[PDB]
Ligand binder design. Structure first.
Ligand SMILES: O=C(O)CCCC[C@@H]1SC[C@@H]2NC(=O)N[C@@H]21
Ligand SMILES: O=C(O)CCCC[C@@H]1SC[C@@H]2NC(=O)N[C@@H]21
Lengths: 128, 118
């Protein structure tokens, strides 16, 4: 891959790329030639659980839009929660590549079922 | 909760009239399809690929609205929890985010869906 040659998510086709959000979480995504997305999410967000473990990620990328899902359970740590992201690609003016997303985090607390929401921006990691 | 659903195929319907049929593996991995019928939306009537994960009382899944027939240039992801009510099965109480790019740029809309198991 190249951050220079990125047109939209069709450019990820048959690639393995690493993205880091503003909380320091990292996802490694394998995008097949059909826009199928699989890989791993490592949550490093301060004051959240299930940090520094790989969780299965699955989704779909097409044109300028992408959606992916993680359940916070891997048979290691279980945070009784699940997160989904939906977003769009943006080319930065410096030649970088970002996925701007909205996440929903569902969990069962003491008061039972709740849903939190926010924004993550993932930045493509060059790794040359 | 969704630990029951392991190795099963289930149909769910939300209040907007959409139907998703999900296949849950022994690992909590989810595939299947989604048929949108929400008033005011595109890509109504045809199946779209669905992927995500389910474990215990929570679930997250994603649909890109392109299937090689109709392309709405958009993607939706849902995260939700099992609510037990007064029947067999559960409802999924969800938050959805819909991403698309148009004339005011990349936009992400949000709402609630409640899916009902048949
Ligand atoms: O605390 C939990 O229930 C499990 C980890 C959740 C981390 C959330 S997902 C939304 C946001 N984006 C991140 O990278 N981490 C937090
Ligand atoms: O209009 C589009 O861009 C494609 C279809 C979007 C359907 C939305 S996804 C959120 C909401 N819940 C549904 O069941 N359908 C609508």
């Amino acid at each position: 891959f190249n951050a220079q040659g990125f047109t939209d998510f069709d450019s990820l086709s048959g690639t393995s790329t690493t993205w880091v959000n503003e909380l320091g979480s990292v996802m490694t995504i394998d995008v097949d030639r059909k826009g199928g997305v699989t890989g791993y999410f490592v949550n490093n967000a301060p004051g959240t659980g299930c940090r520094g473990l790989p969780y299965d990620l699955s989704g779909h990328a097409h044109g300028s839009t992408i959606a992916f899902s993680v359940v916070w359970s891997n048979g290691i740590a279980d945070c009784r929660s699940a997160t989904s992201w939906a977003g769009y690609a943006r080319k930065t003016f410096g030649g970088g590549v970002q996925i701007v997303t909205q996440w929903s985090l569902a969990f069962v607390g003491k008061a039972g079922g709740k849903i939190e929401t926010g924004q993550n921006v993932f930045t493509y990691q060059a790794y040359d």
